[model samples]
Target: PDYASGMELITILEKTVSPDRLELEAAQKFLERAAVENLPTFLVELSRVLANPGNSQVARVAAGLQIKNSLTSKDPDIKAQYQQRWLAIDANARREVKNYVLQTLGTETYRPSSASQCVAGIACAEIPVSQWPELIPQLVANVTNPNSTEHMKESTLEAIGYICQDIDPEQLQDKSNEILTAIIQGMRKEEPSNNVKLAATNALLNSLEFTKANFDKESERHFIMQVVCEATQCPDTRVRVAALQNLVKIMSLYYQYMETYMGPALFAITIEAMKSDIDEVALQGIEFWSNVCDEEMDLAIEASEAAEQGRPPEHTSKFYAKGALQYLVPILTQTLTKQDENDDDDDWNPCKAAGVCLMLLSTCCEDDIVPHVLPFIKEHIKNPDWRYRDAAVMAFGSILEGPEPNQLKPLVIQAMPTLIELMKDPSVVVRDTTAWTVGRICELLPEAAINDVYLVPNSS
Candidate 1:
């Protein structure tokens, strides 16, 4: 079989391949040969595989993969022929395949790796995202199926997550909440498998974050958080960890919106995580708490400036910091100590999470952050890693604007030259952090960053 002759043989075989053949061995061999020979003939066989209404979905999917691989060809004719073959698939056939895919995704037998790749190829071929929301429900159902394999369920959940990442919630509002609530309910079931429970938890988290743009509008947002807050107490470590990540995402995206309604609940859950036996959960709690503090500080600065201008206070009655501080300080103090004593390899390195926590706390806690955090910053400023130094500087910057702008003057003056030199650090990560820190200091105490002699551009 010379290559050209083999190709002709493939063409002839494809033309004569019987759709009525119940056995796929001959069809498979012919398609494989065509794929090896010429892509046009390969794609034609694939189309026939797709168009053969009698063929099983599994066979069509297999043919789709062969077609996709054939598309890797550099030849323009081959590429064009593949595209034409796809175009040649009747609209109803494509729809049927998509629906079949959705159904398969919900079953224990569904092969996620293949399903995801096939969906990606078809989606790349221009399947509208709007046309795919129905698949999310099926994927969700799969995640909730107790009999589904962990790999398949996780893949299906991830597939739905990836698909929903960019999908506008307004387009699927009705189904979005329905699916989210179902997952939440599924997670609450007694004795659920860890993987199924985790998948449901992650899916809910992803769904909430994806739809936060719209979910904030209704009381349902409050309901969702209430259920999520409960999940933080799940006995399984992985379930709790998954829920914590979701809570963090939800807080990051909807903090301001959910504060009035869910603030106390968030405060409690965050406090519990900070005290958790699991290091990852604690780290997540730290990260989220830091975010809350950051937002609070920004709001406070805005409020303070408004007050200075004789404008009405935007959140005068909210009192976020007053209550948040009560829970935050104790947790940070404990976390900071645990971080200092705990081996860095352990699940919880308060050190890794503490810096970010400090950044947010320093800002949110404002003047209150001075005596407790400033000394810590002053002491750690000499550490080898620039990460700690940046965190220290960020804390200083967060509190420099209000009544105690002068409190950090001494440390700011001392760190100035080192900060400037950091801007040109060899590592881009170091340089970016230094730049951000400098900008923050400039925003807060412009005099320290902009005016001092040592603050002059570092020659090196």
Candidate 2:
């Protein structure tokens, strides 16, 4: 009983593991030819190889990865080609591949992860045309099944999340609430496992876009926000971060609906997140505010554009970021001084996040950013500590964008000489940022870029 197709596919999988470049290239070509010639047969062999207990474990994993690769491509045209090619396969062949892939889900190791993504890849192409109508319903059924293994539900929800993430919103618009039901059930506190809750929360993060109808409903949204906001307090940092991630998305998409959530919970949770000891939590907290500034900036632009046409704007700024500036500048200015000691150029931390947020806030708040930010720069501009000196220059550079030229230049001209000398200061960190600050002034205010020291005025 020689399975000739399986042998050729496994041989190709073996070459992919080869250290030699030529064999790998040759293997890739063979796979390309095999897929174009008959992708269904090629996929079936890969599925059977992974499903085999007698196979090498890496071979099983390799086969699983290739299943994912064959279906997904970064290029839009090629992705459409793969999608078209998938739908052309015979019904039985498609079913065989999906069944084997699902059976492989929830097993230990990287095998399950690969299987989950393959499920997503197949669903991505197949769902849009109604060719794979059972994908979501069946996956949801497993997630809600009492007898389903926890890891099974975990991977199933992950696959659903990936599907919601990559497909056009219209494709999944009808199923949003069904998808939400499964994910929310998994994340509910009574679910009893942080791991399960984290998976669902992560899924919810990607699934938010299609759920406008759910978000539009008062009672549904009331419960939805309640559960998600509560999850932010989970004992595990992972779940807390995931919940914050979902909230960030909620704000970005549903900012109109969030005005009510801000005063009671959003502000306290996000500010607490910014102060988190864990870098990831703080990053999300910083991300939440950054998202708020972005939404307000866009809202302002749209409103002005509407005003130009003499029509009322669709939405107005809540002015939360504008109002919160008083609290934020002080906290952000302190974070600006907390630079990394090693300054590992590649590292990202709350300090860098805070730096970007400072700029974003200035752009949104415009002239108002100066009053809150000036004190920090003035005190630290000539401070004994290099950190504060650099922070001082950083503050000046960040505020350059949002304020008017007249509003900015008086302070700029007064600080001009000191800024130039600071550019040549002993500490590279101090001068590095100071030099950028000087350049920013020149960019935003050429008048400030000038040095009266270098300009000898003609005598009248």
Candidate 3:
């Protein structure tokens, strides 16, 4: 790369650091064009810009992002070409680039710029994990060593999260235990920094699917559950929400093992979470129960014929959804009334989740849920707002399976007229729910839905 061209690229990068929108757009366009015209040399110049500490932090971060963008290009040809150039670089040059990135990673620990962190993460993903055996140990050191600064530890955790998300799972499976232990240390109550704990929680979330070995042991499982449970009580709302999310995932992936903790700790935590005023916290809380219903329903089907056939039951769960119907159903009904007025078809708000959970609850609790849910349905089914109307219909649709066939048949018959009228509701959301309810009625109680009086047009 010529000195004049290098200066030109740096000038463009300087423009990216400008506060003006037009200058930023123009710089981005120029860089994109440069990458297309001669990717190999452009990348070489980018590396040089990144390695030079003389450049302003803004310019250096911008250059690093440019390299990241090239690596993440949607066009397979472009991404492959950039990788090829990265691999073709001489070993000495590559080491210099890597050292510069690691130094940048260690800088600005208190409030590290996102762009610089992203640069280090994306650069790590470009190289194979085997080639960087020391990276994980160094990251663990920064977080664990008494001499290391808090900022460096937090930044290292952030880098670990990105690398875990970007690398192939097969390549990471071997190191999963080491990564998980470090994250647990950061998340433990002993760790003083909320920010560091939060980052480590996020890293654990990213890496959990690949860490089966760590989760398989009884000792490790109980310890992890303890740390995550403590996190739910953190004063930081973000940390509490993150920890709740981890709980939801753990419940779904490791339900069989949850017996030890379900009633004693998991149950209380999730119920409190559902009652939270924070929408994000409540969503995860409701989702945890929703997952319980789904898992138990599957078990019910698998064991249905076991006794009649004179064989041992094929499946069982200690989950107490049936036993907790009194507590779970009332809270779920209240959640139904909490629907957001501004929600759209794509929004999976807690209100929408409550409706889905109600359906699953009806299945899991069977006849026990009917009395609890019926009042909510009757009260809201006639409300003027589309949110209530849709929620009411969703609740009606959900219970068709789990209750006594004859018990709900008459209710379905009586509601047929109102449900049919809702098919032409002004709001598309109302109409969609109405259509789904009608389909469920037909499948579960065809005698109630298939009559000409309900199907035929009624002239006003």
Candidate 4:
């Protein structure tokens, strides 16, 4: 079994001794020698340690992580070398590596986090050249086996999702039916386990790009959206978040096919999600609207480009952004005021996402958003609370680019007196955001901010 040799690598991994002593240097030296000497041998040993149930669970997890990172480097040059090195290994050894991954994945009765990562790397290495023909069937078989535990099905779907994430759409097109069966079996309402269902829901998100053909068929699209919408209401928060992600992507990928679902289903679901106490759920909800604005904004360019080229545009937008602007602007304005006073500079709170969403809505809605948004700015722009005041200006600045210059020049011109004075306000945060709004006005409505009246008052 080479179990003794497997433990040799595990010994260093188990140490976790960095900064504890003259420690990291010792482990790095040994691993570096093993790596530069023979890439295949190190992978095989790590695979052995990962598959050894008796090994320390932490060490096994680390071993599996090491295998994955080595096999799937994110850097293109290193990644190519890993792929070439993998293909250079003999067929017998390659088969053993693949066996080590999937077998452990389906058999791990407890947390299968490590094995899940391992199988995807293995699939990633093999699938591009048609090397592993049995990958999809075997995953489906493991998922459907009567003896397979909830953990097995859950872990199997994780591999499915991860593999779908790493591979190209063209590579998986031929295997769609099998992939859908595996994902839907676990994802459907008939499934008993939340964990299994969550795994399948995420797998559905990653596979959406390649699954366009299925969405094109009316019956197939019906089944998929109905099942997905059901999960969006699932009691489990993670599953609902994942289902929202699927809907968000499909909004862009299948925008032409989503009209029926938008009014009756998406609007209410997303509105509920935007108000969710859970940050992740709220982010996905806001993300859904942002994506709609993106598509609608792009549809304009596509329309013009096709007209110039003497052909019709290939896709059309459902204009969900314009339809939802009234309701969404109210929620976003409230959300903008819901900021944490102690947030870090780079934090991505729902408050931040709400600001971004409002900007996108303004670009798509243009002057239409003014009547909906101007009231919020007036109420909060002078509030003593810095959060409300900062967000009000942020909201004001976001809308400048989309509306007509004449429509906004007067409003911004009137606000310049207060905005210029606030640049020296007690809260530096408020002043920081105030400066951005002034910058936006200068860029988009220059005469309003740069005119002799406003410009002379600012320089002093």
lDDT for each candidate structure: 0.59, 0.84, 0.77, 0.84
All candidates' TM-scores? 0.60, 0.84, 0.82, 0.84
In model 3, residue pairs whose N, Cα or C atoms come closer than 3 Å (at least 3 residues apart or on different chains), thus clashing, are none
Could you tell me the C-alpha RMSD of candidate 2 in Å? 4.3
lDDT for each residue of candidate 1 in 61-129, tens digit (9 for 90 to 100): 565466456432357567556545555556665666665444444332344344444444454343343
Residue 31 in model 2: lDDT: 82
Residue pairs that clash (backbone atoms under 3 angstroms), model 1: none
lDDT of 4 by residue, 1-460 (tens): 6567666688887764555554556776777688788867787777777777777787877778778777778798898788777888887877877777777775554565788887887677788898998888999998877677888899899989998888888889889989988998888897889999999999999888688789889988988999999999899998999999999998878788888888879899999999887999999999998988998999978988999999998876666788888789989988987776773858898989998899888888898999899998999899999888988888899899788889998898789988988889898888988988999888888888778245443354
Q: Give the range where candidate 1 is weakest over 10 consecutive residues by summed lDDT.
A: 336-345
Q: Write the per-residue lDDT of candidate 2 for residues 217-322, one digit (tens) a residue.
A: 9889888898899899999899999999999989888888888889989999988888777889989988999999999999999999999999989899898899
How many clashes show up per model? 0, 0, 0, 0
Pairs of residues clashing in candidate 4 = none
lDDT of 4 at 137: 94
Model 3 residue 219 distance off true place after TM-score fit, in angstroms:
1.0
